[PDB]
Amino acid sequence: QGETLGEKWKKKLNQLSRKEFDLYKKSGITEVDRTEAKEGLKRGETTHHAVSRGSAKLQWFVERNMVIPEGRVIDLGCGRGGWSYYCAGLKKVTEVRGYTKGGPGHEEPVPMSTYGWNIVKLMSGKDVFYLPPEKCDTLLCDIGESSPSPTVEESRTIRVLKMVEPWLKNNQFCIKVLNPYMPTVIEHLERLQRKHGGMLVRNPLSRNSTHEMYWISNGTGNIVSSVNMVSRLLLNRFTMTHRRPTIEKDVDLGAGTRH
Amino acid sequence: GETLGEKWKKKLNQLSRKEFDLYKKSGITEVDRTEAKEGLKRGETTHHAVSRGSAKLQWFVERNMVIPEGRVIDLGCGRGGWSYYCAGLKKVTEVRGYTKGGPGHEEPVPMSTYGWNIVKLMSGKDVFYLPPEKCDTLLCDIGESSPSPTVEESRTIRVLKMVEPWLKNNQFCIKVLNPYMPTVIEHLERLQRKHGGMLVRNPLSRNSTHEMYWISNGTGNIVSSVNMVSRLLLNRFTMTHRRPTIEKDVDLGAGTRH
RNA sequence: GAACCUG
Ligand SMILES: Nc1ncnc2c1ncn2[C@@H]1O[C@H](CSCC[C@H](N)C(=O)O)[C@@H](O)[C@H]1O
Ligand SMILES: Nc1ncnc2c1ncn2[C@@H]1O[C@H](CSCC[C@H](N)C(=O)O)[C@@H](O)[C@H]1O
Question: Does domain A1-259 have CATH number 3.30.870.10?
C-alpha cells in the first residue's frame, strides 16, 4: 500500500503505446531548436554551435542564478560536452574538467573551439564512481539512467547521491536526481539538504517522460511538496489535450580563446 | 540495490539438493504423464501428447492469451509439443516447426494426432540464422537456464532480438527466460510499446525457473507483473511444502485435416 | 556454474 503519485505516474507512463508515448513526452514542454546546429556539426563546424541540448538546459538554471559557475568547474558525466563548453564561456569560470564513461553505445566527448575551449579538458573512459574526489569551486553532475522499474531507478539515484556527497564542501552545484519521488530517495535528499543546502527544481526543457529534477545550490524550500507538484503536473498532462512544444532558439556559444 | 528476482536467484542457488527437490515442485500444477509416456514407448502415434508442452500451451489458449490462426511458426519446437497441439485447432491452416536437434538435443517425433498432415517439423535448424517469414502466429520456447542471472540475461536478450523481426500483425507467445534483470526490463518495455501484449506466469512452470511468457492478447505494467512472480516464488521458500496439483493430460485425438 | 574444491 501507500503508493506515491510519482509511482502512479510511472505505471501510467509504462502502460502507454508508442504513438501515445511520443505524443505525451513532448506535450506542453519547452524545446530548443536544433536543426541549425545539427547540420553544422555534420558539416564539421566547431564554432558557435552547442554540442547538445544540454547547454540550453544548464543555461536555464544559470539565467535564474540557481547555479553560479565559478573558477574550477568539475563536470561528472560530461558526455559530448554540452555543460562543459557552456561553462567555458562564463566570465567567473577559470577551468573546466569533464569526466565521462564512454565506450560503445555511450556518448563520447566532442572537440570544439567555441568561446573558452582552451580551458576545457574532457577525458573519456572514466567511471565516476571510482574517481577520487578533488577540490573544486563548482560541481556539475548529470548521471542517472532511466528504468521502467522505479525501484531500479531508486537504487541508481541513491548510488549517485552517495558518490556525489564527498565532492561537496563550499561550492556551487547542480546535480541530476533521476528519481526523486521514491521514499528512500526522499530520505537521502532530506539529509543532504540539511547538510549542504539548496533546493530541487524542475527544468521546463525536461520531457514529460522523465521525473528528472535538479539539486541546485542557490535556493531553499520543501523538497517533498515540490516533488509532488511535479507529479501532479505530469499526471495532468495525460488527460490534457496534446499541446505543441514551445520552441526557443538554441544557445550561441561563440568562438575564440580565453586567459 | 538489487531486484526481487535477483534476491530469489541467490536463495535458489544456496539450497541443498533435498531442499531444491522439495522447492521446485511445491504448490505448482502438474500434468499426469504416466499414461502418455507408456504409449509412446509402446510405439503409439495417436491421442498422446508428445511432451508436457501441449498442456502448457493449452493454458494460454484456454484463456484467449494466444489465438493460433492460419500459418503457425514455432521456433524451437523440439519434440513437437506445441506444433501438434496447434494442428488440432480450428483456425490454424499450417504449422511449421524449427528446432536445433543434434546429439543431446530433442529431435522431432512423428505423430498422427489430429491435424498431423498440416504439420512440418524440420530439425538441424539454428533459429538465429533462419530468415524471418510472414506468418499469422509466432511461437517461441527457446531459452536455456543458468545459475548465473547475467548469463541468462544475455541469452534472453539475444532471443528477444531475433524474435522481433518476426512480429508484425500476428498472434505470439514467446518464452522470456529471465524477465527480472534490469536490461531485460528495458528491452521488454520497448517491445511492448511496439507490439503490445503482456507478460504472464504459467502455473505449470516449476519454482526453479522465473520463466514468463510474452503473449499478444493482453496489456499491463510488466514491471509489476514480473515483481508479483518474484514475491510468489520468494514466499514459496518459507511456506510449508505442498504437493503438486495433478491435472489430466491433453487428448490430441487422431485423423487428418483439410 | 565443473582446470580444480564444496554446495
Ligand atoms: N558512472 C559513470 N561515470 C561516468 N559517466 C557516466 C557514468 N554513468 C553514466 N555516465 C555518462 O553520463 C553521461 C551523462 S549525459 C550527459 C550530458 C551532458 N550533460 C550534455 O550536455 O551533453 C552519459 O553520457 C553517460 O555516458
Ligand atoms: N537456437 C536454437 N535454434 C533452434 N532450436 C533451438 C535453439 N535453441 C534451442 N533450441 C531448441 O529449442 C527447444 C526449446 S524446449 C522445447 C519444448 C517444446 N515447446 C515442446 O513442447 O516440446 C529445445 O529443443 C532446443 O533444442
Answer: no
